[PDB]
Amino acid sequence: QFAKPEDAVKYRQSALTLMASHFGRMTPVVKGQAPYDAAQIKANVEVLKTLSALPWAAFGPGTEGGDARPEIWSDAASFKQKQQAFQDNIVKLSAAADAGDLDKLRAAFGDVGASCKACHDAYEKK
Amino acid sequence: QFAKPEDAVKYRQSALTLMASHFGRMTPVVKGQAPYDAAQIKANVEVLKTLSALPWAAFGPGTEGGDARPEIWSDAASFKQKQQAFQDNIVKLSAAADAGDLDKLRAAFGDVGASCKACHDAYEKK
Numbered sequence A, B: 001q002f003a004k005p006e007d008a009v010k011y012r013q014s015a016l017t018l019m020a021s022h023f024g025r026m027t028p029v030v031k032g033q034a035p036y037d038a039a040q041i042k043a044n045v046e047v048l049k050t051l052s053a054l055p056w057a058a059f060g061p062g063t064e065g066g067d068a069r070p071e072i073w074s075d076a077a078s079f080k081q082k083q084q085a086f087q088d089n090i091v092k093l094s095a096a097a098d099a100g101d102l103d104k105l106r107a108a109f110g111d112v113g114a115s116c117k118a119c120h121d122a123y124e125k126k
């Protein structure tokens, strides 16, 4: 869906920005600094689930650029392992949200955050 | 969810960028230049539906900036009419996609596009 590589870059950056806001806005809730409304969090995690699937297809062949380390295309299977582990971690977060359990949410949120950081450390340029 | 107004601006711009890619990538299909796969379009419209709901809450009080004309906050009810007409037009697009009908999709796509342009002309800075 991208006319030029720059268009894929701008898409993925926007998806990651949004996806990120939907993750990070839950931090006060997971810390107990804001109240826990199970329905509010369930709805937000549903948005995060949809967003979380979007970036990867905008790292297609020929889409090099932004802060994407070149190692993303040359090691495709591995990049794919990091992405699929992250979304599996998002499935767990959904399960915790859908069940309405703050303890399970906290644990699942932590796991997701670790997956974000793992991909960051390997595949995002300094 | 925004620490500073600039954070709301960056969110809404990213949401509009994404939302826009998901709309515009269907243009070749609606024109017949690309093939029509009903399931592909149904799935894409579902993503568009989710995205289409996201920008508006990032035009909250105190979030002035970007290319948002000042007229967005001083005329709140009206801004709201433009937003709600656009999402009603997105409901119709979903119905056309979910039914699997290229003629209804084309008409509904046109209606959505007109709603984008209407808000643009009134509320987006040159």
Ligand code: HEC
Pocket: A009, A012, A013, A014, A016, A017, A019, A020, A023, A065, A066, A067, A068, A069, A079, A082, A083, A086, A112, A113, A115, A116, A117, A119, A120, A123, A124, A125
């Ligand atoms: C690899 C499988 C990733 C996972 C999982 C997550 N992110 Fe990431 N992110 C990744 C790359 C390769 C990049 C660079 C993209 C580019 O082309 O520039 C990024 C970037 C971000 C950004 C910055 C986006 C921008 O506006 O330029 C943010 C805010 C970000 N990533 C956040 C983030 C979060 C919160 C994640 C888990 C919820 C996460 N990312 C996962 C690669 C990967």
Ligand code: HEC
Pocket: B009, B012, B013, B014, B016, B017, B019, B020, B023, B065, B066, B067, B068, B069, B079, B082, B083, B086, B112, B113, B115, B116, B117, B119, B120, B123, B124, B125
């Ligand atoms: C008002 C109810 C709007 C509707 C409906 C749509 N858009 Fe719009 N858009 C609107 C504003 C006020 C702005 C400016 C936001 C800012 O603070 O800068 C925009 C901006 C865009 C952009 C640019 C985003 C960027 O990266 O800076 C795009 C690509 C865009 N809008 C596209 C678009 C499409 C395709 C729409 C219908 C599917 C649509 N917008 C509707 C206001 C409104």
